[PDB]
Amino acid sequence: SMDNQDGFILQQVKLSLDDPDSYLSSWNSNDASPCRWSGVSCAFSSVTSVDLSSANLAGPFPSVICRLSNLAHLSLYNNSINSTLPLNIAACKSLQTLDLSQNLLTGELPQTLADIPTLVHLDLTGNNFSGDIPASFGKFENLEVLSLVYNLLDGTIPPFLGNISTLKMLNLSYNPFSPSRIPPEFGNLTNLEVMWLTECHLVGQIPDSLGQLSKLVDLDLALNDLVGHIPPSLGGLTNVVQIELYNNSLTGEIPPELGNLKSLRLLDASMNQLTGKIPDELCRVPLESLNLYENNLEGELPASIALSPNLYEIRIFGNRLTGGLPKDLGLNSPLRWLDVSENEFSGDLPADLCAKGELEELLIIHNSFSGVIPESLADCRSLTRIRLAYNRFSGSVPTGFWGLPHVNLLELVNNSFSGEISKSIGGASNLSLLILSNNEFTGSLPEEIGSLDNLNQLSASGNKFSGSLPDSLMSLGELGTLDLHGNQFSGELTSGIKSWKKLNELNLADNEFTGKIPDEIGSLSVLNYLDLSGNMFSGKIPVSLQSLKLNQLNLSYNRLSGDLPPSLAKDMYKNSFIGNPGLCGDIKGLC
Amino acid sequence: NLEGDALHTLRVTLVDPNNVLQSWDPTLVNPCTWFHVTCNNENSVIRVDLGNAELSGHLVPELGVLKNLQYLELYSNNITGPIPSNLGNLTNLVSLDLYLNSFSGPIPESLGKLSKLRFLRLNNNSLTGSIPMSLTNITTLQVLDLSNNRLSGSVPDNGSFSLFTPISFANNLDLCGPVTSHPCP
């Protein structure tokens, strides 16, 4: 006794599977011992473990491997294994862990898997398994981990999976299940730490029973059609760190009992129909991330949230949130992302948002925020996205704020901001989109704007900016939109406009620009929309304009003179040249 | 939102060597902040500006979801395959510029459903078959270029085509009509 043909059995496996990359080259038939072979693990020389992960192995599950008597750990993760899982898999009665993730296995789950008493870990993720989960699964003896994620199972959610006492993790996410309620019997899963039921077509109320799982760490019931009030019993999850209820039809008020969760860090109940005030007790908990966005919540954000030293994510946008943001917000926390957009938030912004220095996203658009940008934000080189638009903000922009290097979008649109753009704009390397429209800003555009070659969009509409366009502005080849309308800009366009090869839109309307249109306008390959209306542009229209294919052209109310070229005669250019006195052309009404 | 998801679908099926569609983050609430995408005051897409972007690959029917789109500019690229039918569901479209590409197959009949279309530039493509008579029923049509194509059959001379010149239907395989030198048989 105590001798085996384990190497032979492995050679049978090798012959059964296609190995184009010859990953199983180490497996030498002629060798006495197989325990030095690639991915083969012997705890005497009996095989206890085989791992053939990412081996480009193709073929059916090799049921002959079960004749390996002491095999405890089998992984065939990330392979091209195909066909139905053989019911003769039960023969592997010594297996504790089985990983068959990222394989092309298909058909109904083998009920015989439950017949393996020793199984502790089962992962069948990224497989085409279909049909109802076998009722035998309820009788798993020592299974702690069940993963059927990203499979094609079209069955209801099994109440019998509640009878597996030893289970720590129930992972059935991203399966096209028959619309089914969460079993209350799942509450009797005493040792469960993870309930991952995202995109499982879950319907109906969340059971009060789910509260009795005190070992629960992660509760993900997101991306489902679950309705009803969030259960107050949920505060019974002593060890809960993460609750995800996002993208559900749940109605009601966020329970105050959630404050009783000492270990809670991440809560997401976003994209729900929840109503009422955000609880003070929840905000008292030192939350890592609080997302309650796209809800019908009302009232003031409790100031207790500022005390948390673990806060990097606050996304509460799309609510009717009144009052002002807490003064100490961002001072005691590593703030990275803030989204208070589409709320009724009012008052000066908390000054110490970037105190920790990891703040990348500041989004406060469509609120009633008033006052001046805090000077601290000038020190915030961490910022990449800033959206302060549609608030009541006034005063000059801090010099440093213009020059933050990794900002790619700066949006101050629809505020009452005043002052002149600093020469510090040259330091904004990552800036691609600059939107300063509908503000009270004044001055001449800095020459340092030409430094920003990577800049793609400039919109400064409804501003009091004045003077000649910097010659540097013509150096911005990558610019696709230039909107300078409703400004006091003066001067003549140069031949350098030729460098605007990638420009899609030029709007210089309602300005004091003077002089002849440069004949290089035609050289702009992708110019489709041109508005030079309400200016003092004079002289003959360039013949190069005809070469351009323009969807929008307005040269109306200028000093342009000479005959309209033959192409321009069309009624499609009817309202394009009104108000230029020296323009005499074929259209009905002109001259 | 739905409009951003439809545009991201296009990103997946297009080849973008220069990463011109990098701004197209599907996790953004709406696609308006994206470069090459323009929106109205109600945050609905009105323009897609992707001319001369070295894009290849194929279009998707999900472009049809963009009901308030006015300008579809995919010109001077190497995009291949057919123009989808769902492009007719673009009720507010004013410009369809697909010229200087390698599009193939028929000009969809659905393009006649574009009641407010003003510019149709499909020139310098490998489009094949007859010019739909539905196009004539577009009252707003002011510009049409179907030149440097391999289309065939009757060239409509009625409705919006009444004003159109030979340069619009030039260098085609076998177009017969009054505008053409050879008559229709």
Binding site: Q102, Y150, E244, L266, M271, N291 | -
Partner: peptide
């Protein structure tokens, strides 16, 4: 592609 159990990332 296989996702993870964590907070949603929808942002303006």
């Amino acid at each position: 592609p296989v996702p993870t159990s964590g907070p949603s990332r929808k942002h303006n």
